[PDB]
Amino acid sequence: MSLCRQNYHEECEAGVNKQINMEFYASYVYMSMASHFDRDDVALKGAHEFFLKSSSEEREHAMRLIKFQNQRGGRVVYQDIKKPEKDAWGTLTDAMQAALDLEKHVNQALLDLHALASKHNDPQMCDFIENHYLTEQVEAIREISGYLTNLKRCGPGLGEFLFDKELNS
Amino acid sequence: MSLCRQNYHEECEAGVNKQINMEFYASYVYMSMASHFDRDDVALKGAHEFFLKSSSEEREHAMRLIKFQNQRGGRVVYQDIKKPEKDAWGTLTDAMQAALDLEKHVNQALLDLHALASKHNDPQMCDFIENHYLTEQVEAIREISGYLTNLKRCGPGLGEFLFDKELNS
Amino acid sequence: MSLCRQNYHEECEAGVNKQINMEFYASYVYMSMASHFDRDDVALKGAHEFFLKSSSEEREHAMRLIKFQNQRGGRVVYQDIKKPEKDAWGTLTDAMQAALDLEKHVNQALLDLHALASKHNDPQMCDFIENHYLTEQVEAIREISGYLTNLKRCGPGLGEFLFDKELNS
Amino acid sequence: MSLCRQNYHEECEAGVNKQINMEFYASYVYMSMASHFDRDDVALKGAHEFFLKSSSEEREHAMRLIKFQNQRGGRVVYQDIKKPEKDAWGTLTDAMQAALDLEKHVNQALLDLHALASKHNDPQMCDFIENHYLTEQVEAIREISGYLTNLKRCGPGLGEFLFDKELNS
Amino acid sequence: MSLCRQNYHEECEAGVNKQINMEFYASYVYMSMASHFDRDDVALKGAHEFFLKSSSEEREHAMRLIKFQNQRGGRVVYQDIKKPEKDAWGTLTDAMQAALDLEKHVNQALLDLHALASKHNDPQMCDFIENHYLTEQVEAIREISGYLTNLKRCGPGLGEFLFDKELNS
Amino acid sequence: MSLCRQNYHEECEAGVNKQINMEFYASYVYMSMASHFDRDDVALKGAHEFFLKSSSEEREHAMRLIKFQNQRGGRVVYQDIKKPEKDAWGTLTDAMQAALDLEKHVNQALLDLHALASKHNDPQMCDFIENHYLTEQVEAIREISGYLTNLKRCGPGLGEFLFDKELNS
Ligand SMILES: [Cu+2]
Ligand SMILES: [Cu+2]
Ligand SMILES: [Cu+2]
Ligand SMILES: [Cu+2]
Ligand SMILES: [Cu+2]
Ligand SMILES: [Cu+2]
Ligand SMILES: [Cu+2]
Ligand SMILES: [Cu+2]
Ligand SMILES: [Cu+2]
Ligand SMILES: [Cu+2]
Ligand SMILES: [Cu+2]
Ligand SMILES: [Cu+2]
Numbered sequence A, B, C, D, E, F: 001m002s003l004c005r006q007n008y009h010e011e012c013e014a015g016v017n018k019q020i021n022m023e024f025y026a027s028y029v030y031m032s033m034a035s036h037f038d039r040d041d042v043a044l045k046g047a048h049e050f051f052l053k054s055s056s057e058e059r060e061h062a063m064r065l066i067k068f069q070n071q072r073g074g075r076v077v078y079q080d081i082k083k084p085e086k087d088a089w090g091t092l093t094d095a096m097q098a099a100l101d102l103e104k105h106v107n108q109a110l111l112d113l114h115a116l117a118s119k120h121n122d123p124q125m126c127d128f129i130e131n132h133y134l135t136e137q138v139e140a141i142r143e144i145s146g147y148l149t150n151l152k153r154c155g156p157g158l159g160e161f162l163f164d165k166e167l168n169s
């Protein structure tokens, strides 16, 4: 018949629907971090822009998965996007730590999704994941890890202000 | 002291947090409509782009409210973003009807939020809402209503294909 | 000695020679579809151009495999290019269905060729295949599947004419 | 009625279908010559490019005949494209000799096809053939003949390398 | 905590440190080949430039591995860079043979490093290797193999001089 | 006869071969410093770039000596490039101190090499050394000495971060 599906396993489809939810979740977390550093009583512009950009990127990550679902002839199925764990994210160091944890969680899920596609012998899906996600996670995690190291080096108060400018401000 | 809050009532703050949730919800609905018209067995490109654009606009609507919360010295508080009512949205006529209903729901909520800000004598908030939201809703609702009328005029099959091109395709 | 061959298994070489034949075959099929829609009594220009382009692309697919054979130090071996199954391909819907089937057949062969290269632990060959072929097949199959859906939506007669313009015409 | 056929004899149509097959065959031969001179153990770049270009030209020769069939209101009918006589083509001198023979064979077939169109009083077909094929064959044959003469003059080893650069390399 | 390491096995880290050493070694070999063809009593400019470029490329290969070590949260550990096997590399044919052997050795080590990363289920590392190294080795080996074939074709004396110009000179 | 050697003493040749080794060694040291400041747990970008640039410069220093060996009709002879003394280089102050020591060691060796060329009455070699090396060492040593002074002035933590930006970052 006339559908495009070929070599695309139901467990893979379901995994992509889960990863779509996880990317939107990460986008939502970063959104909340951004609004937290734009409070009059926090007021760190660099972090605000940096997390707003991160939230927009994660949204793109989701949308590319959504597209891939449809390209493969799967069926996108949405779930609720759960609110983030906190309403207030602490200092810039606290938020970076949380962001590191979030990215590492997203990366584990992509590694699991990749493990799924190879188990099912879907080399196009594996390639997709490697091409658009895995090196990108590696760069993002390394990047945030260096931020943590420098925030600890700079220390609180003035160091936090000056470090915040270097994000991009 | 040193906070910026002035003439900003807790009921208004809470209303903005609700409207933030509603805008993200509308963004999510449009996202699902977009992925629905990008199915190999639906394949209407115009509608796909049109709802993807609408989803991105609603996201911006949310983000501007988030900014306004912080500008006024409120505290943004996020809630879950509920999944949309359907997984499959029907023909382009069915989806436009649903989109009309969604926009009208969003507009009623903004009108209620406006009613709240005038009740509390917050003329800056009222202005904000009128300036960035209300005429925009009016245009969007009128626009979708004309689409319904023309989809009914064009009829199913070929008419749907040709109409879909005129959205922008 | 002085040859370049390394880590390239005879079964892989033979698989590439088979895939070279299959790509030329697909190029020949598309050629015949093109000449069919350029008949005075069929006269669908869009389909003519679209299948002529597809035939040229498949030729490039073959030539890149030929190059890869030589780059790896294999030996290209040609076989006859069999004539296509039909001399006349029907309506634009009939031809698109046949094209979908052809692409899915080519994709299965590439997936088998990939399975061969991983079985033999040839990661460069696997990469080659993923990089130049697999996502390309996925896009092409999805693309033709949407065409089928829209041809069915448009219906015969006028719909076929109008749809044919949208291919590119 | 509504077909375009006029003054176009069935023997001419059948001759064009044969010439279409012969042009594709010549394209296939040149393809194999190209892949032969791109072997790591042959490695003559000029000849590789020169035969790849020749293969692409012969393809165009075929496609123009295919178009002419349809323009005249004939019906294109494809046959298998037979594999070339050899898998390995020898030195650059050996391949040029074989190419000379191939071109002379193609030219005899075009001269026969022309003899057919004049016998049937089809002056448009004769013109077509003269305009797009016959002078082109004459130039190609003369060109390859000069290559043979110079390859013999240059001699084997270094001469072959240097001559190969002059093709275009 | 705050480090970036995730899904990166100690055997992989150690393999990257070994490959870093091997790339620097290859850079050193090519350096010596370059200085050998820049002797007043050898004086082959093309080979000089060609091996100097190759030495610079291998250095880049090393540096990209070093970067990857740090990106993954490994720890780069340097070892001595051993002097090359010879002080004098013979004719251009002798040096090309040695270069072919060196590249094939480097390629086997990368294939082993890749085998290591898949064994440990590190798909990002595998991708890294395929993306930046494996096709590059394949091209380099094929390239040098064609040089050997042409050097043998050209023969010693004048042929060597003329061939040397074609490298780039 | 036909060699270029003139007024070039074997002790000078041997000294240049030693200096070639020392420049490569210094390049290797700077390489390790660079990779040390690119660790996720060190993360000082300025120092990373600054030592990567220094490593590339030292490589050029070596290559110019190699060229000079051949220009004078000497024979380049390579030795192992020993691994640097440490795997981890401490704070930016610790690394700058080590870099100062390394440069001073390289400078003493060049001063000895110069003493050698004047002892042997090789004024071209002396000039070469003065023209390309000695003022360059003087500038580099002075430069690093000012860095030490400012790192001590800035102090640890925030000062180190801010100073690191001024290197170039
Ligand atoms: Cu699958
Ligand atoms: Cu793989
Ligand atoms: Cu890739
Ligand atoms: Cu208020
Ligand atoms: Cu206004
Ligand atoms: Cu293999
Ligand atoms: Cu892969
Ligand atoms: Cu006729
Ligand atoms: Cu005539
Ligand atoms: Cu004429
Ligand atoms: Cu690993
Ligand atoms: Cu890959």
Ligand SMILES: [Cu+2]
Binding pocket: F007, F008, F009, F010, F012, F117, F120, F121, F122, F125
């Ligand atoms: Cu001297």
Ligand SMILES: [Cu+2]
Binding pocket: F126, F127, F130
């Ligand atoms: Cu002087």
Ligand SMILES: [Fe+3]
Binding pocket: A023, A026, A057, A058, A061, A062, A106
């Ligand atoms: Fe993401």
Ligand SMILES: [Fe+3]
Binding pocket: A057, A103, A136, A137, A140
């Ligand atoms: Fe990310």
Ligand SMILES: [Fe+3]
Binding pocket: B023, B026, B057, B058, B061, B062, B106
């Ligand atoms: Fe909205």
Ligand SMILES: [Fe+3]
Binding pocket: B057, B103, B136, B137, B140
């Ligand atoms: Fe709207």
Ligand SMILES: [Fe+3]
Binding pocket: C023, C026, C057, C058, C061, C062, C106
């Ligand atoms: Fe293909």
Ligand SMILES: [Fe+3]
Binding pocket: C057, C103, C136, C137, C140
């Ligand atoms: Fe295709």
Ligand SMILES: [Fe+3]
Binding pocket: D023, D026, D057, D058, D061, D062, D106
């Ligand atoms: Fe021809």
Ligand SMILES: [Fe+3]
Binding pocket: D057, D103, D136, D137, D140
């Ligand atoms: Fe020709």
Ligand SMILES: [Fe+3]
Binding pocket: E023, E026, E057, E058, E061, E062, E106
């Ligand atoms: Fe390398």
Ligand SMILES: [Fe+3]
Binding pocket: E057, E103, E136, E137, E140
């Ligand atoms: Fe290489």
Ligand SMILES: [Fe+3]
Binding pocket: F023, F026, F057, F058, F061, F062, F106
């Ligand atoms: Fe130096």
Ligand SMILES: [Fe+3]
Binding pocket: F057, F103, F136, F137, F140
């Ligand atoms: Fe220096």
